[PDB]
Swiss-Prot record, chain A:
This is DNA-dependent protein kinase catalytic subunit. The gene is PRKDC. The modification Phosphoserine is found at S230. Belongs to the PI3/PI4-kinase family. Autophosphorylated at two clusters, the T2609 cluster and the S2056 cluster. Autophosphorylation induces a conformational change that leads to remodeling of the DNA-PK complex, requisite for efficient end processing and DNA repair. S-nitrosylated by GAPDH. It is found in: Nucleus; Nucleus, Nucleolus; Cytoplasm, Cytosol. The modification Phosphothreonine is found at T176. The chain holds residues 2360 to 3244 of 4128 of the full protein.
From Swiss-Prot, chain B:
Single-stranded DNA-dependent ATP-dependent helicase that plays a key role in DNA non-homologous end joining (NHEJ) by recruiting DNA-PK to DNA. Required for double-strand break repair and V(D)J recombination. Also has a role in chromosome translocation. Has a role in chromosome translocation. The DNA helicase II complex binds preferentially to fork-like ends of double-stranded DNA in a cell cycle-dependent manner. It works in the 3'-5' direction. Residues 343-452 are annotated as: Interaction with XRCC5. Changing K1A: Diminishes the ability to form a Schiff base. Abolishes adduct formation. Induction: In osteoblasts, by FGF2. Its EC number is 3.6.4.-, 4.2.99.-. There is a cross-link at K257, K287 (Glycyl lysine isopeptide (Lys-Gly) (interchain with G-Cter in SUMO2)). The modification N6,N6,N6-trimethyllysine is found at K521. This is X-ray repair cross-complementing protein 6. It is found in: Nucleus; Chromosome; Cytoplasm. One of its GO terms (biological process) is positive regulation of lymphocyte differentiation. Belongs to the ku70 family. It comes from the Eukaryota. Residues 247-311 are annotated as: DNA-binding.
Amino acid sequence: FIVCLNKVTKSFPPLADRFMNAVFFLLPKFHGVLKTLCLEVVLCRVEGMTELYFQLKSKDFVQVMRHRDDERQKVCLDIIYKMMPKLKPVELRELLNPVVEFVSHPSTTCREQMYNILMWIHDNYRDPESETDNDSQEIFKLAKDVLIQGLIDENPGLQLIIRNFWSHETRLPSNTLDRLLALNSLYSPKIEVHFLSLATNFLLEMTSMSPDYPNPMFEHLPDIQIKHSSLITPLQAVAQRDPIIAKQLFSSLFSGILKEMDKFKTLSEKNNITQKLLQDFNRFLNTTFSFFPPFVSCIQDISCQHAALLSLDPAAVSAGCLASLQQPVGIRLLEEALLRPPDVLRWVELAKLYRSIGEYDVLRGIFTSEIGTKQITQSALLAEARSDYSEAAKQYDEALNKQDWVDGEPTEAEKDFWELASLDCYNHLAEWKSLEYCSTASIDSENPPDLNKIWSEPFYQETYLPYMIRSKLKLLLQGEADQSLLTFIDKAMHGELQKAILELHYSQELSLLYLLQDDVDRAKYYIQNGIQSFMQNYSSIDVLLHQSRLTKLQSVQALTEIQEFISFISKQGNLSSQVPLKRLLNTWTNRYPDAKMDPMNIWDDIITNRCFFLSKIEEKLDISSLIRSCKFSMKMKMID
Amino acid sequence: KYSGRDSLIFLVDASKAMFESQSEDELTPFDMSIQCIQSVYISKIISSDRDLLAVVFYGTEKDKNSVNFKNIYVLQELDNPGAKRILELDQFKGQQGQKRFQDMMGHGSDYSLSEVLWVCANLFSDVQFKMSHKRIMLFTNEDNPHGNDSAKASRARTKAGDLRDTGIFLDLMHLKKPGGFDISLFYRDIISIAEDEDLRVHFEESSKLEDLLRKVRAKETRKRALSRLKLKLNKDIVISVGIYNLVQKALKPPPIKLYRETNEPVKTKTRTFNTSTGGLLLPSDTKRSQIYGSRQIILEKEETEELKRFDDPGLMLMGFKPLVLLKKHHYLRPSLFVYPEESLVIGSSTLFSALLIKCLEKEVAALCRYTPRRNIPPYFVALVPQEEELDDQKIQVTPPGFQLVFLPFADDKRKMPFTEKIMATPEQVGKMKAIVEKLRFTYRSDSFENPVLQQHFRNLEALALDLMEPEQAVDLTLPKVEAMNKRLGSLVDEFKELVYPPDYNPEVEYSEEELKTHISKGTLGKFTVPMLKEACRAYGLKSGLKKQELLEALTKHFQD
């Protein structure tokens, strides 16, 4: 019946009007191509009938869309396009969710129909901006988000269509300055890898209507001097290829337009434009999630070269530079901003930036003149400057607990610096027990619940989490049965708020924890992930930023030592006999982190890891007063 | 057709007048409807436990449906009837049940009468199985739901016509309430069964709801071929027929073993275990056997089925016999039915029809040799031509075709003892005739129900819905002794005096020494079989059941 009806109505739309109820009745009884025939029959007559949404909702029309079938999905999008002009906003909001989870779909015809219905839904829901309904202002926002995500898709014809639609008038103004201002409204942090190339493409596409394409010189085979269009077009073709030249081009265009506005504008309006640009840049730095090095660098660079954009949020700058490993540009921006109260915040952010790339001398230098203005802080920092990490931490904690100091009531920033420096000083010394209590005694009362309290106000994760986890780990490998991360880590492997953060940075620690309670199959994966993360971090670091690449490089010794231990334990061949153990001990005692060149944190990592590996080996199998002899020799080398 | 399952959707009103009723002993119509739906559920779960039933209250304050519609509630969706589904419904019976419904559902909240019909069609369209029939009963105590708004009436009529076109037949079982109006009104063009009736305006009683014959708690509906055989008129000319059974003994479903601790079914595993030496045995080292006296006959498994094979499966015609030679006394098995089928041989129906016509024209019955399966011995059958009989309502009661009649062999006929022929006389045969005429009876096939099956089904209902006591079935096969005695009169005593003479009323402890002494005493007398059995069992000797077995074995072994 349905086959014959579709065949008849393929050329005769007027029929099947009397069979609409019947075909709707049999619609949910099919699962194969007959369902596609039913939807096609429905598609034949959509305009001449009403109350269609009720019937589709009754027949779970939303669910059948999500099934993977090219013809069925295309027909579903087609009927949606046809019946959408008669829809209602409340129903359109429900209908919008299943069609937007479709951008990652192959068969670009479906995407083309998608973007067609989205262009329609964007043109009619633009609205005169009068407050009419929340749904009318929500479906438009959801659709606009998806449309920008369509600027980076494959099938360059579809991308060209979307670009033409976006660059048309009444959406992106043809005026140069207005277009530049409105380009910031098209961020869509879902796409930013190509954002600079697309922005400069939109900026330089308008110049093709410009009435200037002659030879921009007088010609004089010695010279082939040629018109403008032969220089702009290759510039764009190379800008959209790699990001560095695109960043340079966008920065230069921004600077040029900003400089040229000064003629055709007034100061009162100039202030509004600058404030809008600053707000847009703040939104850029706040909403960004996959921090792009060149994009962040370009934003901070154009910010640095303008007196109006120097007031950019220091917390956002610090977070972006730390996450994208682009410290120097943010450092320069903050230093320039500090050259013309909300000043200790800038100093705090600058200290946080400098600490990341070493240069501890400059850190201590700025932790005296600006942060401080007391007498205990100067003495503590002077003690810490020389290799004396006992008096400094002692007097830091003495100054931390006090009801005295009625001579100024030390500021909050100085107290935070006191706590952080005390933690750092405890880390330089081998006082992990003393470090853990003081690191965890800043979020709650005695016996604090280190659970979702650090995972709140991410400053906690930034400051106390690494020291606390390192202290607990080191204490556990010392030999103390004080298991508290095991439950914490195990229940932290849920969601992204406690796993992605715990895997982006801490991977060697996770590998040690997992091979601690032996499930070495996961420890191997964790250590490979850690090596890959280190490789990515090194790749992102500059080439002339010394004392920062060295710091990242000094951990490859520990990484390789743990990897070699995992390989040694996995193969049972080395477990038998004693010559593999003798060879391993000979190799380990031959290569050392050279003295007078490596700070003691690397020494402690290496020695503790080696001692723990020896202890773990001394559970499955002379081989005594020899393993202990190697341990004693390693510790003696540590002392020397 | 065969695999289709009938489906049913109820539609109970919940209006204000639907709840409030006259203040007497008569049930409120809501309780009547709930009791009737419960009865339909009970009838349809014991009989054909594969149909789909669902109940959709309309007019409620709440709402539950696939598409959000006001004042329509789908208490249950289409599924097989279950005990929990019945128990979910009986909580609305009575005044306390009425209050429970009011606090859980509500009443009033004027409806549309169209969205309810749309909802019913939705569940009808949501089934992934076949749909043999689609029906919607409309329990209502009102006949003119609308009239103040013609648009709603028109929409309801259009939706009803659409449902009828789709293949949905609704029939309202009208409820009668005090007043004077249940008139044929805006429901007449909606009843898609459109049952024939006088359509009398001034109905003053409950409508066709007692027609349910509530709780007909015994049925198992099915139609199947049961065989597909070839009727060989000769060696080379054969026709293909099917062998249906019209009447077949009904048995209660077999019990299922259960694990007591968890109340879950336990699978069984029957396997011939070792020979006290360990291991398992093949179907190839276990031959069948029989013993006759001292001779043991050993015979293989396949050879056992080989000795009972005579003919290939089919009906070998062997001649025609007059109907007057088929005596009524001879009867072995229920009579089967033959119909011409055209799946194995094309053209069987025409020859079959010609044979039937010319066989019932000459009042003769075909005689055949019947072999239903591969290895069954032949059994003669007289194919009696059964002519189609139809009622005035165009309803078939005896479908046309041939009917098997198993003729018994001489082995299956038993011989009676000699009896002396003593004949009655007039003047009491007349009295017997008067009594018989005074005890008239129009026997019908749909007269009696199996009392054992009825009691078992009622017990199961009581054990599945904790009715606190099983329903006592009225035993329809019990004679109405008092009523028939009163109807008879005093002529029974005239009978009794006439023939019956005046004086005719018609109405352990045993041990070694006692057995050693008793074998010489030789009685083993008042010694009972129960104690011989326990002696032979507890002592360990082989034992049987007949007395002589033990009396010989114990005597021969105990002394010798």
